[PDB]
């Protein structure tokens, strides 16, 4: 690279890109990366902490690479650290990592692992490709029947396309470095949506308003579209669940995240003694977080008594029998907000 | 004739037992002062005569927890000790007021994002017969009283 | 039953057996005073309804040290005489509660930079029963408590 | 329901409502259960402590049952423990039960049996359904005709309805609480 | 229980702890003051009922920095004794907050060719209990703000 031997300065002429860092808490993705990849081995996460972190392990930023060229988009639009696993191996690594919270294929195909790792329990997401061809109104519920219905997931359709890299970049992978902007700067309850994106992007495929109200019904295919005032942006927040409690990614997550720093409160209490002066600990250490969550907006309601309720008891959760087994239950609610998703205007052309 | 059950239901609660437990934490106190919520009033008057008056901007929470001096722990003082400029890790409080020998609980306030100002050192007197005593102080916000 | 090494570990320390030393010397003390740490607190507070309190600016260390006036001894009042206009001998002054007749710390605080201001006289009463004692008071900077 | 294999924490994701519970010691109800309920056997009482306790001795909680309804209601509104006797075994378990003071009926007919249980020196007080039908002011003393005269019943009139519940509770089991 | 990198991303910067740096020197300052954006304003109106309001000449930025009076250095005076009839060394003034013993800068105030107008000596009193402090004041422009 550079061989220094005088004190001096040094006046190379080099052309290489560099990307601000930036630092997520909510937000860890999991690249999926194909076999035939030489740089990283099978078995083990390589935790790659910003673009210089990954561009030490590769020696040359490749056009070709479906990998290369979806990193440094995630990079540009303000993506914090993230594993690269191999996608054969993907299975095993992603339980042994603890705040892994996003799943993504960059252009991988994973619909075998999310059926098996993404559960009601655990805190994963996995956002996903829409599929590369460009497709139809007409064969629409077609593509629709290709994914999964689990509420985890979401599908970004276009394939989005760049002036330095060479082919397209699979969008899941600009997406995850959304996801992080998104809820650093507004929070997690906050949609993605009407996001542009920080790098130089635009959609393989321009999409017409009637193509995107098949996909936004059934097993929802969210979309990067074209805006003249706002240049590329994102425009869907809905999961693969058409049922009304999971139907928004912005409800999803927040359940995600809400759970997990749960879950570091009840850390705590790991291996106490089971009676009634550790559940008023339990209890008081979760009030305090969902409180302090609801006066951040995260949690919709006027009433502070309205937003959520925790309950544990002898006489309520649970039984004297439980007890002796070591078990300890705790019974938590939250109201979300949910996204404003159409907006209906009615012009009247006589005033009164 | 009263039921030492209906002494549980009727009659108030003493004091002095009591378990304090700061964060992951639960350290024995002598005392605990302050603790208590407080509201500005907002007075409106006009000309007519009506008068209003308001619940106004909430005060802030001011607690003073009381601890004899124990020969290999210095766990209050690590704690204050650990300020750098406006960084120190707050946590939660919870004051519990519990029967003898505590396996139950009877009332429990809970203080949210305290962080200690005020270390009081212990009086050295040579002419006295107490315990060293510290006193720290903690600024938070946000006692709440809950049933049991 | 128990053991005299189990008070050791157990229990707390009394305040009336302690060490003063004043830079290189030590001297006997009747009582320490003061030589507690504090913080001022900055509260940010905006419209939409989020309170932040922070820790601040730490407050200047004031001590008190009272000391009977012995025959042949003024060593309190030639530290406080050598102040010319700003310079004086700044010494570090240590207080350790130990054991009787102390061989052994079981607690240590340490103050830097200590310099005197305000040496207070005895006052002279013809009907009392008391000993000539003295204050010397200190400004300081950083006491920090060490454990034995 | 949940099987432990990790020590961990598990966050599982269920919709199961929580009733706070409380203690009574004046009040102890009877609640009358039809036959054709397959959870509760013949004379013997069983005693429920709590709304977590009765929902471990059946699986679900059902909308369509007058039982299930009338205990949720009993519950939410304030009550202690009682005991689950069925009506035509009634009259052979609550003189055995020392601590019971009211008789619920949460629909049903126990119109003869409260008439050979309470007596003056027992310590029985029955409260009791109106008609379900809605009446009139116009044929209002034949429906005091069907009803006894006894000072230890109070007859409350309107069949409650709830968003939870399907069909509508019968307001005598929200009265024991 | 806010963590400590918490309040590193979300709380407020204080104003007391602060680096200066007057060209290649760095100096230890008491107090910055003045430093800010302004613009005059161009304002149109015609007769139809438009009314244009438009930014407009950009305004000169004036510095005030204060700084006591050690014994050995004078280098805010020569800086300014060194003004020959319209020569002037100017040099470039950071202002940086940063947290306690500073590694770390937290924002960032950027002055260019900044020059020294009015060095003011300190007021001497003979009942007076301060130190001897001198402002320098600075006549600049483009004062930028960089994050971090």
């Known amino acids: 690279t550079t061989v220094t031997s005088y004190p001096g300065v040094y006046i190379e002429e080099l052309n290489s890109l560099a990307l601000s860092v930036s630092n997520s808490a909510t937000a860890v993705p999991v690249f999926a990366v194909d076999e035939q990849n030489q740089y990283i081995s099978e078995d083990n996460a390589i935790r790659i902490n910003s673009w210089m972190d990954y561009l030490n392990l590769i020696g040359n930023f490749n056009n070709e690479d479906k990998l290369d060229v979806s990193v440094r988009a995630y990079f540009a639009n303000g993506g914090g650290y993230c594993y690269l696993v191999k996608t054969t191996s993907l299975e095993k690594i992603i339980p042994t990592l603890d705040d892994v919270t996003l799943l993504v294929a960059a252009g991988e195909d994973i619909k075998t692992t999310v059926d098996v790792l993404c559960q009601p329990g655990k805190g994963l997401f996995a956002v996903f490709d829409g599929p590369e061809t460009e497709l139809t109104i007409n064969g629409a519920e077609e593509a629709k029947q290709a994914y999964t219905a689990t509420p985890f997931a979401a599908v970004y359709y276009p394939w989005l396309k760049a002036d330095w890299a060479n082919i397209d970049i699979p969008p899941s992978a600009v997406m995850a470095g959304v996801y992080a902007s998104v809820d650093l700067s507004r929070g997690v309850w906050k949609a993605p949506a009407n996001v542009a994106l920080k790098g130089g992007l635009e959609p393989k495929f321009l999409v017409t308003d009637e193509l995107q109200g098949e996909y936004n019904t059934g097993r929802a295919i969210n979309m990067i579209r074209n805006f003249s005032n706002t240049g590329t942006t994102v425009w869907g927040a809905r999961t693969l669940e058409d049922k009304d409690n999971w139907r928004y990614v912005p409800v999803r997550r927040l359940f995600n995240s809400v759970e997990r720093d749960i879950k570091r409160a009840m850390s705590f209490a790991m291996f106490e003694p089971n009676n009634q002066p550790t559940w008023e600990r339990v209890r008081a250490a979760i009030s305090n977080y969902l409180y302090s969550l609801w006066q951040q907006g995260g949690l919709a309601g006027s009433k502070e008594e309205d937003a959520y309720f925790v309950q544990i008891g002898k006489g309520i959760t649970m039984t004297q029998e439980q007890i002796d087994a070591g078990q300890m239950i705790v019974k938590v609610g939250l109201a979300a907000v949910r996204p404003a998703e159409f907006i209906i205007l009615q012009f009247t052309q006589d005033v009164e | ?148």
């Open chain 2, 1 to 148: 004739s009263t039921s030492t059950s209906q002494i549980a239901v009727e009659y108030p609660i003493p004091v002095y037992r009591f378990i304090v437990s700061v964060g992951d934490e639960k350290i024995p106190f002598n005392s605990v002062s302050g603790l208590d919520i407080s509201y500005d009033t907002i007075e409106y008057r006009d000309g007519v005569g009506n008068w209003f008056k308001m619940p106004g901007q909430s005060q802030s929470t001011n607690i003073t927890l009381r601890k004899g001096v124990f020969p290999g722990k210095t766990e209050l003082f690590d704690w204050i000790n650990s300020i750098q400029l406006n960084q120190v890790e707050k946590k939660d409080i919870t004051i519990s007021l519990t029967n003898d020998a505590g396996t139950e609980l009877l009332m429990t306030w809970n203080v949210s994002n305290a962080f200690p100002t005020s270390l009081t050192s212990p009086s050295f007197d040579a002419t006295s017969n107490d315990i060293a005593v510290q006193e720290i102080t903690l600024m938070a916000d946000r006692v709440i009283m809950q049933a049991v």
